[PDB]
Symmetry: D2
């Protein structure tokens, strides 16, 4: 019943912040505070209303909100980076990428719903530790998933399982064919968020750029499921790795959070007498140098390629990335 | 190791009722369950007795502690540490000197450590009402309690975590049964009938030629251990007021958060979970009058009279809250 | 399965057999054969139609059939006794007991649905081995359910979980109120099928018969949930232990099956160097003596008490039981 | 006795392609996986090398065999015993002599033993289409294959079933990875790529000073092991005609049962699963021509001329079934 799916007297200020939902650089942390730590719920609701997804897929509003609160509730409040705010941020970022001029009218409502839903559940129930940590401790999770994309497989399973809780099935009115297509796309997208698949994804993105085709309109031509799903996988992957491309003020908050999470894993590994994972040793860390390297070897190569695919739609994003790259470089203790 | 001195000194009270469990949490860097459990195992020489390699014990303790939710106000690793330490004290009670075997002692302490592991901070009914996977798995029956048990045992399977690797098959079988029995008894839905048998036992109470309580059959020995851990789980109001108020603050925060969740979901708000219509003080007095005092009064009878100081503290605490009940 | 809209020869014969669905002693085995091993699906369907349960609870017919076949599919065809035929028999038996004159107009449609649904899923996915066998082998099932009513808890979990497969939620149209009540009653009933609960269950039944109340009609009076569910638990429990009360021809087929299942467990326990459970040693067995003891110590005491509760409705059932008891008795070799 | 000797006499062909596995199934009281595995373990001296207590091996084997479905026509304990035995023979081929370590041998054999455990007798697609809990768990990806691994590993935890209890952490970590890699490769959705990489290796075939195959990295090594088990899994058509025919009747019966289930549920009937419109003989020839022969031809190329007889038996059977095609 509430205007943003969540009760809030600061609804005025919250409403104002949400006006930037279509903009790169939304004040997601402010929205998290104003919504009473319900950024995923309010942002998803706003986006669904904005894209008219409730009517298009006959999703009852109470069901949508119940599912969103349930999903958000399963992101860990104690985890510094992989929590509901990161989830809300990836959802909103994907939302903007989907609206890029170069992709206008390219994707169907079902593909849009898939990319957005995938973004929302992509890190649900994340414990704050890597796949390797879960594997080396012989966790029940790694056992169930045979050490392959353990967390990613788990995020998907949880995201879908929650649809079964009371009044949570937001896809109850989709046909069997829509549900099967939606389910396959969502799975393909989330499994692509595993960094072990980064290089092959990027390689394929580049190949697409090299043989890039556009329709009579000025938009990208995507013929087969293979090319369509590949763009969606890279889009959500880009959103997941979009932190360095956001206004510095936001970027630095993300860096502080992921570092806090990395160090916590590092402390746990140390306690258990395990080899400390890269960048997880608070006693031997180089936050700034690590951000520069992160940009140079991962983020920039990816976004430069994405920028080429949708040229010149993402020039400003690429420019921000570079300005941010320099800032961290300039703060490296000599 | 500057603080390593404060922690060590603080731990000197591991045998005293009223340990500064919260200070220990901070000093140990939020590892009260691990530190306290380790101290007690060393103290009771449990590692040698059951040949538990030290590295295996600590790895399991950290693993168990890691599965308690840091974001939950009351049902976290601190509560777990508190219940273990309290069980440890109740075990050392005079009236039970040399009564229980080292395996029964291990069981009571182990059960205490894992009794609330992976608690989500919401009640069984909330899990049931939402059709949660946990409730579906356990058929809405002692949902969380069954889960705590399953998780506690399952974690023994992680790398270098099997602390019972050197127990015999017979020992494992007996330990497993006792633990299950003890933890399932922590379900408040078992409280009443649990208390009845505790009274009935105090009525026909018998003593050995040593002045120590006489426990024959499994049924009686397990019932005593069950109530012992149950008393430890409901020992908050018996601790010095200062610790007690911190526990009340914590449980109320947890309750209110559940109520906030129920409200935003359009669900009926659970008793005492509505922050807009609460009676914190009145609920504590009712909690003491109808549950905690009747329970501890009886335990104080069974182990008469080493628990006298505990019961007197309880009654003083009740009066204090009573005096704070709004007009 | 039909043709040109008319029944096939087999279907017609099956239909004729189902005419005895309201009678004690249905040829359930012939029905299993005639239905292509779908006794549970056909008997449940016949009963739902007969009691107008589809309209009452707005259960779409295709959803009911799909769920029934799915549920039946999860009973093990390789298990001699605890299979879909046993399930179908308990369902049909419960169905007959529900119609006893002494209980006319006593239970609500929801309570009737609960008793029948509970009967249908009460042994689903039964492995053919006892709880103790599962406990002694440290099976995953035993681990999950803490060695407590392991199989009974599993039967319920599976029965409910299957409602989540494609087009299987037969309760999709019930209100949350109806669903919570149905679920609680179903759970209470199935958990009551654990033999460990037999004695206390019988004690409470005797107690009820002592304080038994009636009305202007020879109908029983059940004031609260406690007495209503108690009667329902014992009813299904009686149905589960009704083999000895059936005509000898049927009773003997059940005895052969339970003995085969027992001996199979015994052989597995012997293979493994485990102590052979009571009556599971095919080399040291007393089939006749065991059936006599089964009747004297469990079955007769239970049905005698139930007969009292609904006197004289169960007179013929009791008489049949006693005749069968005498037959097995006279069969004991000296 | 008699049936005991007949069995022991049959087990003598354990190292030969064409073992009378069905006869062994009958003679052992439906314990083909257990007796054949144990025999092979003795034959390779695996109990000694890895210090596997015999009671633990027999207990695990019976347990694993117990988790294969007796009511499933093809994917049951007999198929598992067969794939195990076939892999055992393929491991002894001359071209591979002295190549694999004992752990890699164990991996290939263990993987073979558990590769289809708890198979329901229906395809991944059927499980996905019905929204089964299994498919939800594994995200519709290699659902059954992932499940077989999970169950095979989980069963080591039952009472006295951990046949790897004496392996070092290093051995366990390596064995686990290899087994996972091998079993996941048995998913037919990976056939094409597997055959491609195999052919590539056949073209860049690096022999050794002993004429045996040369495998540097873990990648080449596992690739051969994965393809070996895959070949074993798809070896029915290369066995003596009397065996091959029994396998065909079984897979057809399993396919038809799935088809009847799909039909009764109003689902599209899967390829070759419609008993009312089938071409058994025709389908076998197609299976040999597009998958089995292409795979074994490449394998024979890798171990040339080691599998010449196996390959010839295949072409032979192919012609038998072909001539069986009515017109
Ligand atoms: O697992 N995972 C999937 C998606 C995203 C993320 C967070 C994501 C990430 C997001 C924001 C980050 O910082 C900032 F943008 F907030 C950040 O900082 C660090 C790499 C140094 C990392 C990572 N991408 C690759 C990561 C690796 O550790 C790498 F070595 F490449 F750096 C990995 F996993 F590839 F080995 S971590 C983590
Ligand atoms: O479920 N559960 C099991 C063991 C312990 C606890 C916490 C335990 C508890 C612990 C410390 C408490 O306060 C303070 F001692 F810290 C406390 O305060 C409240 C009753 C008002 C409650 C409870 N025992 C019974 C509880 C009930 O909600 C009751 F209605 F009785 F109050 C219940 F569950 F019985 F209905 S809650 C909760
Ligand atoms: O576990 N379980 C629950 C419900 C029903 C059944 C089958 C059920 C049963 C059903 C038909 C039987 O025979 C015939 F009626 F088909 C039958 O024969 C045997 C007791 C010897 C037993 C049993 N009820 C109690 C059983 C016990 O093994 C007993 F010791 F009493 F015999 C038990 F479990 F009580 F120890 S088994 C089994
Ligand atoms: O799923 N699966 C994994 C491993 C082995 C098997 C049995 C295995 C198989 C084994 C023995 C068979 O017959 C006989 F050798 F026993 C047999 O007959 C059929 C192809 C028609 C099939 C299959 N391999 C590929 C199969 C396909 O259905 C194909 F379309 F190719 F025929 C699949 F899955 F590729 F689409 S089935 C099945
Ligand atoms: Mg992720
Ligand atoms: Mg608890
Ligand atoms: Mg049963
Ligand atoms: Mg397979
Ligand atoms: Zn992410
Ligand atoms: Zn507790
Ligand atoms: Zn039954
Ligand atoms: Zn196979």
């Amino acid at each position: 019943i509430p205007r943003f799916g969540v009760k809030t007297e600061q609804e005025d200020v919250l409403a104002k912040e949400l006006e930037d939902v279509n903009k790169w650089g939304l004040h997601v942390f402010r929205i998290a505070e104003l919504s009473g730590n319900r950024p995923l719920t309010v942002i998803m609701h706003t986006i669904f209303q904005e894209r008219d997804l409730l009517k298009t897929f006959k999703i009852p509003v109470d069901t949508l909100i119940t599912y969103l609160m349930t999903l958000e509730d399963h992101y860990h409040a104690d985890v510094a980076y992989h929590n509901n705010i990161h989830a809300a941020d990836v959802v909103q970022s994907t939302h903007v990428l989907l609206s890029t001029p170069a992709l206008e009218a390219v994707f169907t409502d079902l593909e849009i719903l898939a990319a957005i839903f995938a973004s929302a559940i992509h890190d649900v129930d994340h414990p704050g530790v890597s796949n390797q940590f879960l594997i080396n401790t012989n966790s029940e999770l790694a056992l169930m998933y045979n050490d392959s994309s353990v967390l990613e497989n788990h995020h998907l399973a949880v995201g879908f399982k929650l649809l079964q809780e009371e009044n949570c099935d937001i896809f109850q009115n989709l046909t069997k064919k829509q549900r099967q297509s939606l389910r396959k796309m969502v799975i393909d997208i989330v499994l692509a968020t595993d960094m072990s698949k980064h290089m092959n994804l990027l390689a394929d993105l580049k190949t697409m750029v090299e043989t890039k085709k556009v329709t009579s309109s000025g938009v990208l031509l995507l013929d087969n499921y293979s090319d369509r799903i590949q763009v969606l996988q890279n889009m959500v992957h880009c959103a997941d790795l979009s932190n360095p491309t956001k206004p510095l003020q936001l970027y630095r908050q993300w860096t502080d959070r992921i570092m806090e999470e990395f160090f916590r894993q590092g402390d746990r590994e140390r306690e258990r007498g395990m080899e400390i994972s890269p960048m997880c040793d608070k006693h031997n860390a180089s936050v700034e140098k690590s951000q520069v390297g992160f940009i140079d070897y991962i983020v920039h190569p990816l976004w430069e390629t994405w920028a080429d695919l949708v040229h010149p739609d993402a020039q400003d994003i690429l420019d921000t990335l570079e300005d941010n790259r320099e800032w961290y470089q300039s703060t490296i203790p000599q």
